[PDB]
Amino acid sequence: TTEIHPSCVTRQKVIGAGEFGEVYKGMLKTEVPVAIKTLKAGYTEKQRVDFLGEAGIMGQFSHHNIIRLEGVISKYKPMMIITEYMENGALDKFLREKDGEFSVLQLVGMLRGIAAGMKYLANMNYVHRDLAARNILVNSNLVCKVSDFGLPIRWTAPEAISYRKFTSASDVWSFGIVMWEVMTYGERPYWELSNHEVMKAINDGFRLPTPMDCPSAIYQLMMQCWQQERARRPKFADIVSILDKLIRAPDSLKTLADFDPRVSIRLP
Numbered sequence: 001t002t003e004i005h006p007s008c009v010t011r012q013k014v015i016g017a018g019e020f021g022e023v024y025k026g027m028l029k030t031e032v033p034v035a036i037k038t039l040k041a042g043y044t045e046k047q048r049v050d051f052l053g054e055a056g057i058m059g060q061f062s063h064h065n066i067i068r069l070e071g072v073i074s075k076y077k078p079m080m081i082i083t084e085y086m087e088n089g090a091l092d093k094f095l096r097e098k099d100g101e102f103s104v105l106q107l108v109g110m111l112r113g114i115a116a117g118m119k120y121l122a123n124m125n126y127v128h129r130d131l132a133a134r135n136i137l138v139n140s141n142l143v144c145k146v147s148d149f150g151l152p153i154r155w156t157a158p159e160a161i162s163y164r165k166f167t168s169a170s171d172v173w174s175f176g177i178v179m180w181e182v183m184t185y186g187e188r189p190y191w192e193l194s195n196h197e198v199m200k201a202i203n204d205g206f207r208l209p210t211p212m213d214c215p216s217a218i219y220q221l222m223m224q225c226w227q228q229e230r231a232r233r234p235k236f237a238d239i240v241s242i243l244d245k246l247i248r249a250p251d252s253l254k255t256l257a258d259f260d261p262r263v264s265i266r267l268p
C-alpha cells in the first residue's frame, strides 16, 4: 500500500468519526483534497489489525465506482487512511438536498454506477454488509463511489437479520433498497414503521411501493432484489446488464409504474 509521509498531509476540518480516531477533510501534496481517517494513541491490537487490514483491502480495489485509496500512514503515529475527497458528499443527503433536480436518466445512471461497483466487490469476494445511500459518495461528475464509513434493519436481507448470513445476495437486497432511495430522492425506507414492524411486513410478503415517476423496469428490478429466497435474486452481473441496456435504449425508461395514491384530491 502506498505509504505517505506525514509532512505531505494537512488535516483541516473534522467531518466524522472512526473506530478509534476521527475523520477529516484535508489536503495531500504530491495539493489534492482528501479524506483522512486516523487511528489515535491507545488503539488496541485488534483495532490496529482492522485499521491496517482495511487499508490493505482498499488498496487492492481499482474501480471507477469504488472509493479510491490515496495511501496510508503506518510508519508514524497517528496512523491514517487517506482517500480521494468527494465534493458532493454522501448520496442520501445529496438527493434530499436536491429533490426533483435530476432527470430519470441521471438517476438510473447513478444506479448503474453503484451496481458496477458492487459487481466488482462481489467478484472480488468482498461482502459489503452495509450498502445504503449513506455509504455512497458522489463526485462533481455525478459518479457514485461505493464506500463504507462503518455503522441497518431496513436495508438488510431477511437471512442476514435472522441468522447472520451475509453474502453478495444479501447485498443485492440492500441494492434494491438503494434503488428505492435514489428514485425517491432519499426517502426513508418504510417511513415511520419500526424495525419490528418492517421485519413483520417483509415476512408477511409486503414490499415497498413504487416511487413516484418511477420507470416500470426499475421498479420491477428492485422488486426482484427483494425476493425472500436468496437464490432467486438477480446477481450483480444481471443488475448491471439490465441497467446498461435500459440506459442505452432510454425510451425504455419512459414507461412508468403506476403510483398508488396515498391521498385523493377531488376537483372539478
Ligand SMILES: Cc1ccc(C(=O)Nc2cc(Cl)cc(Cl)c2)cc1Nc1nc(-c2cccnc2)nc2c1cnn2C
Residues within 6 Å of the ligand: 015, 016, 017, 018, 023, 034, 035, 036, 037, 054, 057, 058, 066, 067, 081, 082, 083, 084, 085, 086, 087, 089, 090, 137, 146, 147, 148, 149
Ligand atoms: C477516509 C476514508 C476511509 C475509509 C473509507 C471507506 O470507504 N472504506 C472502505 C470502503 C470499502 Cl468499499 C471497503 C472497505 Cl474494506 C473500506 C472512506 C474514506 N473516505 C471518506 N470518508 C468520509 C467519511 C465521513 C464521515 C465519516 N466517516 C467517513 N467522507 C468522505 C470520504 C471521501 N470523501 N468524503 C466526503
